[PDB]
Amino acid sequence: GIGDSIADSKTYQDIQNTIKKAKQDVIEVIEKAHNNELEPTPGNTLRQTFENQVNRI
């Protein structure tokens, strides 16, 4: 049914919190890449390392 597709009130808050913190970290990564403070890794373009760590996050 749909009673089997729903959660309690505590879990929703936890999911919102972790999503907010991830969307936070991505912003710090972006804004520290706009001041040329990123260092590429061996065999990786700057775009490559940026997108790699944002995909990690």
Partner 1 sequence: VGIRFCQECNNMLYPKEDKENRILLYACRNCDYQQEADNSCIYVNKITHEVDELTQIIADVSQDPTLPRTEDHPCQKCGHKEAVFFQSHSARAEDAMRLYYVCTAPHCGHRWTE
CB of 56 to partner 1, least distance (A): 18
Residue position matching structure tokens 């919190």: 17
- Residues ≥6 apart with Cβ < 8 Å to 26: 54, 57
CB of 26 to partner 1, least distance (A): 15
**Segment contacting partner 1 (CB under 8 A): 1-9, 10-18, 19-27, 41-49?**
41-49
Q: Which residues bind partner 1 (CB under 8 A)?
A: 33-36, 38, 40, 45-47, 50
